[PDB]
Amino acid sequence: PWVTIVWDDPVNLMSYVTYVFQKLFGYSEPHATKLMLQVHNEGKAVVSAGSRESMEVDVSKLHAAGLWATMQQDR
Numbered sequence: 001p002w003v004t005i006v007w008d009d010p011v012n013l014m015s016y017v018t019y020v021f022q023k024l025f026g027y028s029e030p031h032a033t034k035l036m037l038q039v040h041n042e043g044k045a046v047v048s049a050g051s052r053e054s055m056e057v058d059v060s061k062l063h064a065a066g067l068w069a070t071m072q073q074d075r
Ligand SMILES: C[C@H](NC(=O)[C@@H](N)Cc1ccccc1)C(=O)O
Pocket: 006, 007, 008, 009, 010, 011, 012, 013, 014, 015, 017, 036, 037, 039, 040
């Protein structure tokens, strides 16, 4: 299994990131906000998990929204 990681960046608005997580993944507002704050406070956070092919899509969707996203195998 793989995971998609979003990395903190100095340009994107906190409010925008919360919205992007809801729009792209259907997450609730408390869930999206929690992930956004984890990124901002820890520098990164797993935002989704699944097969390598599934995470490839999530990364591409996040890049199109302007967020710093990568994927890696889950240990
Ligand atoms: C402009 C400022 N944005 C931020 O401080 C960034 N770092 C917030 C963020 C959170 C998660 C991922 C990427 C960026 C703001 O006032 O919102």
